[PDB]
């Protein structure tokens, strides 16, 4: 690989241009660290330009079985095949991968999205129909001779660096937190802090369902109890009363013709040395999201997981280091509005007052 060629390979969610088959067909593919399937539109469908026509690729081969994926707000079904893929911005060769071509979907291609397939970059264990459907990144690692690492920067284009870390995409040090389970990119959250004030929740509350780093989720999603605790704390810490209940639950916009008023939100993560922790911090600019200028709240409740989505990933260079079973973080120099950093990272802080494992 050539990592310097990978800088600025993302557009838009955030998507990568990929060429599938012979002759190549160009698709726009969402980068999703929260699933494990390479799946693309296989038929015309409302709210997409393009789709992969398997009949037009001379190298395509059908596996002769289908796959159905169900998530919480929807689903898709596709034929499973294999074909040759090129990534024009990164590698000069093509690779043989598994592919799912979607021929029906329930609530999956929604209006206004600009991708037409998904690239799941998580672990084999999440792959469907099963974990023996070799994931896109497992293929690339083996065939492209690259390290078992990738890293992401989103500038809210962006960068997906397959097979390493690009030094020009960060300043300061990278902080590494252990991967706790290799399915999603599950990490250990030790504490949430608002305006400098810690919530008073048992740290198990933060990992209760599970805390994961997911680029295929837009918002910071928090378990109900944790979400209530945050909203109360942001309300409590903002200079003037600005927000209706409607704003907090995404059901209303907040408008001005307004930023010193709202607090920073910090997430504490266990270092590789479990006695130490580091903090990733977002400023109101990242969670008070521009849509008179109106804004939507960047955080929403979750039943199933604590999801470190784009709201947070936008501030950091995130390094998914599968080879050493850790997820790394550094501040993104691109994450700046009107001259100011919209995120920070600091450490170390002692974990001596926290349970030595916060995951139930």
């Amino acid at each position: 690989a050539n990592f310097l060629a990978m800088v600025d390979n993302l557009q838009g969610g955030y998507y990568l241009e990929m060429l599938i088959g012979t002759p190549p067909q160009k698709l726009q593919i969402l980068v999703d660290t929260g699933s494990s399937n390479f799946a693309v539109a296989g038929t015309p469908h409302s709210y997409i330009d393009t789709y992969f026509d398997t009949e037009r690729s001379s190298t395509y081969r059908s596996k002769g079985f289908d796959v159905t994926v169900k998530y919480t707000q929807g689903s898709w079904t596709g034929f499973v095949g294999e074909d040759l893929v090129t990534i024009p911005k990164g590698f000069n060769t093509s690779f043989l991968v598994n592919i799912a071509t979607i021929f029906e979907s329930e609530n999956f291609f929604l209006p206004g999205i600009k991708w037409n397939g998904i690239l799941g970059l998580a672990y084999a264990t999440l792959a469907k129909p099963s974990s023996s459907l070799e994931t896109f990144f497992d293929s690339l690692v083996t065939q492209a001779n690259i390290p078992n690492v990738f890293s992401m920067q989103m500038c809210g284009g962006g960068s997906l660096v397959l097979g390493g870390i690009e030094p020009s995409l960060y300043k300061g040090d990278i902080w590494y937190t252990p991967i706790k389970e290799e399915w999603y990119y599950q990490i250990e959250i030790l504490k949430l802090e608002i305006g400098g004030q810690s919530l008073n929740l048992d740290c198990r509350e933060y990992n209760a369902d599970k805390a994961i780093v997911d680029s295929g989720t837009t918002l910071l999603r928090l378990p109900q109890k944790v979400f209530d605790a945050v909203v109360e704390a942001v309300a409590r810490a903002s200079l003037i009363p600005e927000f209706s209940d409607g704003f907090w639950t995404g059901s209303q916009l907040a408008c001005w013709t307004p930023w010193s008023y709202f607090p920073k939100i910090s997430i504490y993560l266990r270092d590789e040395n479990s006695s130490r922790s580091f903090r990733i911090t977002i400023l109101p600019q990242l969670y008070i999201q521009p849509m008179y200028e109106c804004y939507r709240f960047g955080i929403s409740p979750s039943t199933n997981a604590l999801v470190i989505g784009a709201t947070v990933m936008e501030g950091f260079y995130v390094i998914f280091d599968r080879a050493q079973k850790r997820v790394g973080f550094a501040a993104s120099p691109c994450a700046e509005i009107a001259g100011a950093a919209v995120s920070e990272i600091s450490g170390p802080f002692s974990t001596e007052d926290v349970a030595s494992n916060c995951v139930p």
Partner: nanobody
Amino acid sequence: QVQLQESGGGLVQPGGSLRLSCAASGFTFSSAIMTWVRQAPGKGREWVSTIGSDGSITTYADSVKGRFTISRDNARNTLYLQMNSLKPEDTAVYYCTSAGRRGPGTQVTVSS
């Protein structure tokens, strides 16, 4: 299971040849992309060859193109690599791999 087991290696002279096998189990072999890779001590891992599940699509590293042929027998759950015109730089543990799993590998030495 995925369980993979390579065999067929040995000590061979320059210009010689070997036929490697990889016996698979614990997954549907006739459904899986299969890959050979190699690593020699003190060197990075090097991709050798990949084959699609039906066997009709094959790709090769430039360093082996023309001298090695990958193939498979789905009914026998076996992957093969026919190695010809072997040279000293082909020395390595050859591993077969699928879905992020690998077998323990087989030793190939090419020498006088």
